[PDB]
Amino acid sequence: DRVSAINWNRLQDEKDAEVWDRLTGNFWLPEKVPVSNDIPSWGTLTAGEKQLTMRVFTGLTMLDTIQGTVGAVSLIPDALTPHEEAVLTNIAFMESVHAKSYSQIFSTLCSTAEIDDAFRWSEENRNLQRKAEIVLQSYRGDEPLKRKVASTLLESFLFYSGFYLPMYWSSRAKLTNTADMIRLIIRDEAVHGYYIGYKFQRGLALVDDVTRAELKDYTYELLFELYDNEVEYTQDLYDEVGLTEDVKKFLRYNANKALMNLGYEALFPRDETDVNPAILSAL
Amino acid sequence: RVSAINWNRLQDEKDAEVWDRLTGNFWLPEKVPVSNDIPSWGTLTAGEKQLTMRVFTGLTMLDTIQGTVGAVSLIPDALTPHEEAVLTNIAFMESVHAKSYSQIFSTLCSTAEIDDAFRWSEENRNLQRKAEIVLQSYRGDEPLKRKVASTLLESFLFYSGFYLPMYWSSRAKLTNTADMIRLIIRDEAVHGYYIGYKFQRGLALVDDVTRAELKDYTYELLFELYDNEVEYTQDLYDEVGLTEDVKKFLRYNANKALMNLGYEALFPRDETDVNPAILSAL
Ligand SMILES: [Fe+3]
Ligand SMILES: [Fe+3]
Ligand SMILES: [Fe+3]
Ligand SMILES: [Fe+3]
Fold this sequence. Notes:
The structure is a homodimer.
Chain A: H1 14-25, H2 39-43, H3 47-75, H4 82-109, H5 112-124, H6 126-140, H7 144-162, H8 164-171, H9 176-204, H10 209-238, H11 244-261, H12 277-282
Helix pairs in contact in A: 1-4, 3-4, 3-5, 3-6, 3-7, 4-9, 6-7, 6-10, 7-9, 7-10, 7-11, 8-9, 10-11
The complex binds fe (iii) ion (4 copies).
PDB class: reductase
Keywords: ribonucleotide reductase, tuberculosis, radical generation, small subunit
Assembly: dimeric
């Protein structure tokens, strides 16, 4: 059936206009960040440190490929307003921009062989493939609200967690221009998670008590299914440079943030999410 | 199952040239100052104002469809990951195009005129029919047909609604509005091209019998859209005396759409001889 022409002179929810204006006013492309000034500092990393960074960036690239090309678009049919549909087309585009920014970093700093090996690792890593399957299954299913749970967990939990490393390097005066690129991605991702979680809460208010309890159950279930897999992914990547336990605190910190974006309470208390202060500055 | 995109290996570089051109042409409606058209706008008859708002509202409808359904419906049928990325850009920019008509309206028009135009768009049977013909193709299960419909939408239906703002611009009226429409045109020319190109790439992957079916469908769909567009054009442009010339522009654009899909021009040059001031104004 019918599509109505959109009328931006009759807003149904002013939040849609505010998010449009913010997301569009923050438009950027990766070519405008001078990553080539990181070449000296990338030279000071060991082969193991460079491999870890490339692998983490390849995993993030996967999540943005999923969010732009499947995630954000699968939300469009469930919009409450026409203007939300428009915002979702911007979010899809910007996820593609985020995914391409990693290729711009690699193109400036790394060799073809190192890149090919990072992409091959991502195809074969069981934890990365499992995290993709879990969100893809929710996006392709037929329950709108559960899809926004998965999306917010992708934006505010899974994604945010791989940002640890560029911020760890930045805090040691390394790879500072790469860190600037990543802060452009975070500035988008904080809005996406906020907006999608907002629309989730508006959707929740229109269902009965039973459905609402079902969604809180599902949120916790998917959160801990993702969290379990994310810990295993985190261990295999970070164990050798010794950052695992601090990244796991960052994961707990971010899980709380995902829950709050959805309108639920923080689960982990403050003294168990106490990330190295330098990492928090760098965001 | 979804692989991370690698922009350092391209199955088809065309995807990266198109990405570079579309993203490099990024714009938002507020950058164009339409308020300088306020005096020009007062020189139109109520009829000419109504015609302009109705045409703009039809175009808004098609951009709403193309951003929110069309471009995204094309993403599962992509040949490359880079094409899927391009399509997210196209979907976004269609939402910008649609928004731009609201920017024009909010500067120049009254609330009651805006509402009249949106209501006409809900009710007009030729506009509803064009919308249903393309939505049915977009929501169907035949990828190459969907590309035919999307190319006819970008290169034939949309482009035809650009006649009016270029008409006004050729009389030195509404020239800022015109600069806005030329930003849309610069994106649409690439959209139609690119999608038609991907149609041609996809034709090489099926067999000769299927290609022959698609050529039939293309003609049939064109004839149906053309005829519906003539009725639409007549009801809009008959009173101001523009119909004959717009109909030449419809054929002119029907040729571009066919050629974007890799087919021959249907109408001969003596049938597409649109007022040269309108072509130049693009
Ligand atoms: Fe992203
Ligand atoms: Fe995002
Ligand atoms: Fe458009
Ligand atoms: Fe277009």
